[PDB]
Design a protein around this ligand. Structure first.
Ligand code: MA4
Ligand code: TBI
Length: 265
């Protein structure tokens, strides 16, 4: 594979779309690669990680408990609820809801959680409170990935998302236990985690949340590194490409391969 930046360019050329990417040291925030890092991209399902960071903040403040059981109704379910559709009789705890939203991308779980933090506006206010003045959530789980051109709703920038994830995971804004919980939820991703490990060389750590939307929208927020360490945050978003899901997946994997082969920069 070529250098990361050359591979990113090849991906835009092959996809006919825009790629946005940031590679950042998790411990220090050192930016290694930045391409269209200040441009907007639909967050898609990656918003679920920020969502649970807001939930954890409420737990830390004593305004929420991960143990609290929420009972909901079938009428509350939206498209794609693999875990939540199984608990109409007994409910789910707030912590189980975050695990379902992040590790399974359960949309009903995400919407139930979103209501607890004040809806899209409340999550956006939380983002402003931690210093992210760019990322914005405007719609609920099954409408936020429409990806209309020129539509600023439900978007982030690679730089903003990377900085925000770093703040949630390492800045002590969240308690030690909450930081550890948010990280473990990403380590536990069932949607893409196992697949990524299957193609990663031995020794590489992965934690992640992926997303997909219309007009080719695709993305991943991840922690990656050799020696089984979460050394860097890598955020990659794709938008406005008519390519098949397989090819968008392949191009993102290709950027990952360039990173893996040329890690020491
Ligand atoms: O020399 C480095 C490595 O080169 C190859 O590894 C390949 C691997 O066989 C392939 O499957 C992967 O594809 C990349 C898979 C990436 C999957 C997703 C990565 C995510 C993670 C973070 C966010 C963006 C993308 O590339 C590496 C590097 O060429 C060799 O197989 C391996 O033995 C060797 O140690
Ligand atoms: C988050 O990015 C969600 C994207 N796609 C979802 C959806 O729109 O709700 C579906 C259900 C695919 N999916 C399942 C699990 N992760 N993604 S839709 O694109 O089929």
């Amino acid at each position: 594979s070529p250098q990361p930046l050359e591979q990113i360019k090849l991906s835009e050329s092959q996809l006919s779309g825009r790629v946005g990417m940031i590679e950042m040291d998790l411990a220090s925030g050192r930016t290694l690669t930045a391409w269209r890092a200040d441009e907007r991209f639909p967050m898609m399902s990656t918003f679920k990680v920020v969502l649970c960071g807001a939930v954890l903040a409420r737990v830390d403040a004593g305004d929420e408990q991960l143990e609290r059981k929420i009972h909901y109704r079938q009428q509350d379910l939206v498209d794609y609820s693999p875990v939540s559709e199984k608990h109409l009789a007994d409910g789910m705890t707030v912590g189980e809801l975050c695990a379902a939203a992040i590790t399974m991308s359960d949309n009903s779980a995400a919407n139930l959680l979103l209501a607890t933090v004040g809806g899209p506006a409340g999550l956006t206010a939380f983002l402003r409170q931690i210093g992210d003045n760019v990322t914005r959530l405007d719609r609920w789980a099954t409408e936020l990935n429409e990806a209309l051109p020129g539509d600023a709703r439900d978007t982030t920038t690679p730089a903003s998302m990377a900085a925000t994830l770093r703040k949630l995971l390492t800045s002590q804004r969240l308690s030690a236990r909450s930081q550890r919980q948010l990280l473990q939820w990403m380590v536990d991703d069932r949607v893409a985690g196992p697949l990524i490990r299957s193609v990663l060389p031995a020794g590489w750590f992965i934690a992640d949340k992926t997303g997909a939307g219309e007009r080719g929208a695709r993305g991943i927020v991840a922690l990656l590194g050799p020696n089984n360490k979460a050394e860097r945050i890598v955020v990659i978003y794709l938008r406005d490409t008519p390519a098949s899901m397989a090819e968008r997946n392949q191009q993102i994997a290709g950027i990952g391969a360039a990173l893996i082969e040329h890690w020491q920069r």
